[PDB]
Amino acid sequence: MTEYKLVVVGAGGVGKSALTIQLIQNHFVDEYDPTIEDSYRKQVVIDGETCLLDILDTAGQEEYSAMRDQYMRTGEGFLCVFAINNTKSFEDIHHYREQIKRVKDSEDVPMVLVGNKCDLPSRTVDTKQAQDLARSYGIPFIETSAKTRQGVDDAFYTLVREIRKHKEK
Numbered sequence: 001m002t003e004y005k006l007v008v009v010g011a012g013g014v015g016k017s018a019l020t021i022q023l024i025q026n027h028f029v030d031e032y033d034p035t036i037e038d039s040y041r042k043q044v045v046i047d048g049e050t051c052l053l054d055i056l057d058t059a060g061q062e063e064y065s066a067m068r069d070q071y072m073r074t075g076e077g078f079l080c081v082f083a084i085n086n087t088k089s090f091e092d093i094h095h096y097r098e099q100i101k102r103v104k105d106s107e108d109v110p111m112v113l114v115g116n117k118c119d120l121p122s123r124t125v126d127t128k129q130a131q132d133l134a135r136s137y138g139i140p141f142i143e144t145s146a147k148t149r150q151g152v153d154d155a156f157y158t159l160v161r162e163i164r165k166h167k168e169k
């Protein structure tokens, strides 16, 4: 077993908690306090190898920004989540990509771009815009719904594969 630190980032309300709780507890939680930051463990086998995932469901500002920097430094891979009906949340991805690279002082940081809430109407962020951005970063892009579970396992397990690829470089 190897333990991997995964960090779920994105604007408030994009579905970080709903995605994480789906993976951990296998249900859609409608209401989970937006101000709670917590971490969860889950063991899974990926490509024949047993992994312990230590997943941080972030909630934004910290008491001290030094704490944010620390979880970015210890985080091995990042799920960068936006909501497909919230253009601002998508534009914020530029900032997350920049910031994480800055804190880690690295050009090569495992990440997956996640466009969540794909079951909702009135999309404002086109799939193509997001695929273009992910391509520009060299990272995977997956659309998800924490409600239906579309893409949820794929997103987390793809991130583990990205972390492994980075480590085996």
Ligand SMILES: Nc1nc2c(ncn2[C@@H]2O[C@H](COP(=O)(O)OP(=O)(O)O)[C@@H](O)[C@H]2O)c(=O)[nH]1
Binding pocket: 010, 011, 012, 013, 014, 015, 016, 017, 018, 019, 029, 030, 031, 032, 033, 034, 116, 117, 118, 119, 120, 144, 145, 146, 147, 148
């Ligand atoms: N319909 C739908 N609602 C979602 C989805 N993901 C999150 N939500 C809702 O969006 C709101 C914000 O979700 P939450 O997980 O608290 O977002 P966070 O602030 O990023 O942790 C909540 O009302 C959730 O019920 C999704 O994929 N589909």
Ligand SMILES: [Mg+2]
Binding pocket: 016, 017, 018, 032, 033, 034, 035, 036, 057, 058, 059
């Ligand atoms: Mg939350």
